[PDB]
Design a protein around this ligand. Sequence first.
Ligand SMILES: Cc1cn([C@H]2C[C@H](OP(=O)(O)O)[C@@H](COP(=O)(O)O)O2)c(=O)[nH]c1=O
Ligand SMILES: [Ca+2]
Length: 129
Amino acid sequence: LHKEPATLIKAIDGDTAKLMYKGQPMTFRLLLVDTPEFNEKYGPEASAFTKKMVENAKKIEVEFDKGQRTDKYGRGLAYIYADGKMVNEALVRQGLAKVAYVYKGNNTHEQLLRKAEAQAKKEKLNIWS
Ligand SMILES: Cc1cn([C@H]2C[C@H](OP(=O)(O)O)[C@@H](COP(=O)(O)O)O2)c(=O)[nH]c1=O
Ligand SMILES: [Ca+2]
């Protein structure tokens, strides 16, 4: 896989954000994770985590997997990096997202994220508390 440039347009919630990519606005959904919705437990905490991460970054990048690049809603499906740190992984490592929606052919970072989840679950962080 390879990282490509994008810029933040607006934070949305724990696992979506509006980015400019190839000069067009798109809503991206984070591959291989699920955050709570804003109205659910840990929802606001996930939204705040992702917001801080993407807003404070000097450089946002998107990394598509080998499969579908957009979902049925027209959302971009990617791994999002903030100054080189993967947001997807960070959320899971903090117990603010579960590994989820692991579809065949877009699952390159699955075992990275499952290792993060195991460590969050050992620490009883957040969703795992
Ligand atoms: C993360 C992801 C979600 N989706 C679809 C599956 C779910 O369909 P349904 O809307 O029918 O439940 C939805 C979950 O996204 P949200 O967690 O943002 O709701 O997005 C994909 O198709 N591919 C993906 O990689
Ligand atoms: Ca969600």
